[PDB]
Symmetry: D2
Subunit: 355 residues, 4 copies
């Protein structure tokens, strides 16, 4: 059942670059991503909105495409050279995956691009060529109190984390942190190319589903302001979880829900991982500071809800149920538990979440 390593060389992946999300009401989505969140328009028409963060120079970090069923259509990684698109094609072909190459791109402002149904059922895109736009990094006349400054990562729900981890490691992603138990189950892994804690991450669950797309801010007060704004707009019900400090990654975070329930994380101030012997951190699944360092409870919807993903024909990918133990069940379910201090019943929670 393992995914064999191709003999063909892996493409040299720089970073996560953009996501294409199918949305059902383009105007409602535009209000969320432009008016609430302040992303910058790179192109729009009656069918699509192309958006970028404050410090981006490539054409976009987010494409909103009107469609009948809300879903992730592609999660796109930029590769180092044009020849790396050829490498990506040969690599996935050797893996036995369905691939589609468009020499003029799938979306505006991207050139030669390869989309694939990857071995975990996810629609990945690889591209080098992209239309450069004005880098807005010093446009403080446009800067919002909640400004989103970079695209940081994706998070994928998949049933077998070790299987997916090994596949991503072969593609050159390096694991930085993970969550395990003493019995040897892996519940989640984080992995990177660009020298932050992650470009993508695997959350154990029924999949393929897209858990979230994450944008960063400069400072913690910028995340606070997003929350404050949502309260002023009386859409606080769309704040799912946070704001908090993560255990894994050490980042300050917030999770919010778009009009189609696509989950967006806002994230800041993780650490440098670019050294090849970067120390890998393993948390125990029962540690109540692993996800929220302050011990705040993880709402069940965070574990159970995630976005559909599409195949290359635009149809929804069938889901495979996780057979490994469930993080939700072992921590906050009827027979779950967590601790503040390992071995101490004081500050422990049994069959219950924290707080």
């Amino acid at each position: 059942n393992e995914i064999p390593k191709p003999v063909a060389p892996a493409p040299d992946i720089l970073r996560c670059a953009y996501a294409e999300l199918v949305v059902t009401d383009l105007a409602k989505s535009r209000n969320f991503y432009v008016d609430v969140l302040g992303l910058h328009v790179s192109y729009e028409d009656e069918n699509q909105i192309y958006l970028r963060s404050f410090e981006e120079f490539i054409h976009h970090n987010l494409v909103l495409t009107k469609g009948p069923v809300a879903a992730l259509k592609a999660m796109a990684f930029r590769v180092r050279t044009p020849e790396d698109v050829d490498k990506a094609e040969a690599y996935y072909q050797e893996l036995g995956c369905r691939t589609e190459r468009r020499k003029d791109g799938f979306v505006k402002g991207i050139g030669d691009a390869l989309r694939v149904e990857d071995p975990l059922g996810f629609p990945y895109e690889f591209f080098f060529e992209t239309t450069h736009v004005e880098r807005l990094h010093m446009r403080y006349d446009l800067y919002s109190a909640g400004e989103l400054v970079r695209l940081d990562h994706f998070n994928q729900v998949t049933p077998d984390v070790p299987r997916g981890r090994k596949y991503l490691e072969d593609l050159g992603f390096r694991v930085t942190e993970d969550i395990q138990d003493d019995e040897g189950t892996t519940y989640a892994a984080w992995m990177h190319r660009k020298g932050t804690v992650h470009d993508t991450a695997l959350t154990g669950g029924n999949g393929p589903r897209l858990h979230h797309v994450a944008f960063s801010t400069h400072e913690k007060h910028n995340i606070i302001q997003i929350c404050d704004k949502m309260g002023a707009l009386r859409i606080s019900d769309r704040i799912e979880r946070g704001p908090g400090r993560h255990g894994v990654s050490n980042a300050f975070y917030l999770y919010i829900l778009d009009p189609d329930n696509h989950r967006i994380e806002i994230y800041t101030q993780d650490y440098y991982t670019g050294d090849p012997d970067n120390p890998t951190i393993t948390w125990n699944v029962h540690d109540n500071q692993r996800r929220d360092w302050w011990g705040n409870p993880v709402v069940p919807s965070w574990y159970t809800e995630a976005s559909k993903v599409l195949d290359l024909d635009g149809n929804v990918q069938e889901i495979i149920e996780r057979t490994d133990d469930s993080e939700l069940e072992v921590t906050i379910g009827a027979d779950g538990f967590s601790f503040t201090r390992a071995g101490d019943e004081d500050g422990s929670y049994h069959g219950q979440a924290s707080k």
Copy 2:
């Protein structure tokens, strides 16, 4: 039932000044307030620790007094003149309250002071005279990433909020914000002298009990650091609620628990209330943004748990039960309700707390 307005003039109260808290293990409490929270020691011996915030010049903002039963011993307000302590004494005597006056103070660093058992059963102190100490407001060589800069307010649990409110208004406190419902019930009120949202507040519940004492920080990141530090110390279980943004008050906040479960709020960035026609804001009790503006749920312990208070002899005040509706029950209990948008079923909660 109503508390009459005295003929005697009310004392001119400046602000909340300090609390004296009884604690059971002086060493454990010191470690919390000094090592974890960073408050500054004005004086300490084997029985008491006198602590002050970064910007304070009066002797202290907090006195920890070792004793057998953890409780509030005195909540103190400073008055404008020495003659206002005379006014306070005559005022509470007309109210028929027990009073006790000491020209040399009850605690170190306070001179002529009046303590009273007020009409709600709380131990109030009024004083003018205090020993000035080094104001540490520019001692950035001492400044902590979580620095507590000022004492901001107290919050009192009392069963009948309107009764208490009228009494505090006659005493010169002005109501800035409150929480009511559509059936004539008041659940909470905030009231001030110094021109911030409050110097004290009333929370409807069984009482007298002390809900919390609140200290300010300069910035929101200072509150975040307190949380981060508690995680590093592996004492995140002592974070009760927050961090968040309040609806009422608009302040950024955090609630933590000391070793005797006394609740401390960290608070920043409320607004100016010093004009006498300052607009009074009333929230509906079912508005899920009233306590946490982001809609985060209020944990039941925040409603049910609070500190004992002492009388002037040092004995615990008997608790009188609230008969008015319970904010817990009407918002997050089995028959509770809250809304995100008034009149919208979407984003409303029936018989449970927000966010799952």
Copy 3:
């Protein structure tokens, strides 16, 4: 030349409330205060713009009034009761000052108001009645990265600081901080009613002139953002001084210049002064951490330039020259001196400013 204490009781002043500035080009001024700084419009027409801060509930904190000569037309203080406007009139009449009373106000959204040519030549207004507006304190859908949240203070240039200080003390302002030297000269004083470091302040120099109006932010990053935005708009030449940490007041600060060179300070995180025995802090004029705690030099324009003020007829008040020693001259001038550490030659400056600079 002491100003006597009246027998008539002083009005009970709450706080500074608004300033009326005469501006020469209303559109250019609106661009600065609304588009650059983010203040909120309460009312406007062809002649005036009425602006308020994020947390204000009275009608306005600033009125911009088109006129031929840019100047301060009124610094306004709110009093506690309607009766305090009568008290103000009686008080200033006893002081021998010219006064003008308008039962329906001088500017929109203010009711019964008294304006006075005060003993230092400044146009003060006292009022209680004002039209309440929507308080925007939780309108985070409007909140700017540089949001101005309150009006904090005024600062006045006057030739004789002790004379003015005594008069303001009789009026009920308490001095929180001052700058003096060891030879009896007062260079500046800060004084309050509302329980912050100040509602107004006196800066020694030729006057009457208005030094600045100050607005506060929530946090230091908000002030940084104003600077950053001015850079992006390529108007960094309108940043006069800062950003910095003050010694006096301990506030984080920035000084900028509007289209008519009216100086605006942005300010945050001073301390509580409401207790009646609040300790008064006196800094020595030669302490190089007194104005900028980090030792950064005070640009000469900060000491020399300030706005004209008008009398009740709208004519510019004549300027009276300061004869006391000049803060500029004694610190950064040719015979000037400043220290980092009292009594240490190392980190001291002789005949020049700090950090490697001299007067242009």
Copy 4:
């Protein structure tokens, strides 16, 4: 011209640490540990080894007691052990003096190569290093001014294009630079790790070390360092700032250690890891290029820098810049700068911005 070797360049990850010679170890310890809050990895009577809050390698700064304060080595970590062999072959082909120590020059570094590079600078290349407790979640230690990473070095060298070409051959990519309309280069910034820079060249007499830079999380952390220095009554050791840079867009501060070694505190520059990352060239007369808010650049910033040592520990001879001086063309008596290109309003002629002339 410095030729491109046939031998492959070592794969450089990032700047890693500097070794600074200091004259009074206790006074230097007070500055770096007590004032700035850096974390001790090792110390004795001869040296102090210091790391930032988020570091896992042994150290980011070695303070070595010696007779003459100077930079002794600026060290870059390479990707594999074999890259140290590549460094050695590369610099030997360049004709540079090299010294190889299989067990390191300083504690907590293993196999290492030091070289006197073509610009006169003592560079070290290493892979092997002793891992230590990564303190990134130790909020019980976190100070209000916490220094979280080593970010970069800045080198003073007389001929910027000559140095830039050599660094490009070594794999560094230019992100930003400062030039004039007549083709003079005043400064260039260049990176390996995907930030604006790992090292930078400032036109001037050299070799000299301009500064070492550490990062903070947020801008308020830099403000606190200034506030703390005021409280300690050492504001005279704040040289320049705080400010926002034009070049790099980072929030910054420059301070001076007890031997006048300049330390920058820096935060919130941008991502440069894509290979077609857009370069940005600023005009030397643009008064927003160094401080975005137009604050004047203090003359000492342009004239003063640290000595550097050769592999024997002797001070490297200084070679004079012959290209135009940035100080002179901008803030000297014949200099000029502008706020808006072509606008006399907001321009400065023969003095610095904001009303000052040179002291």
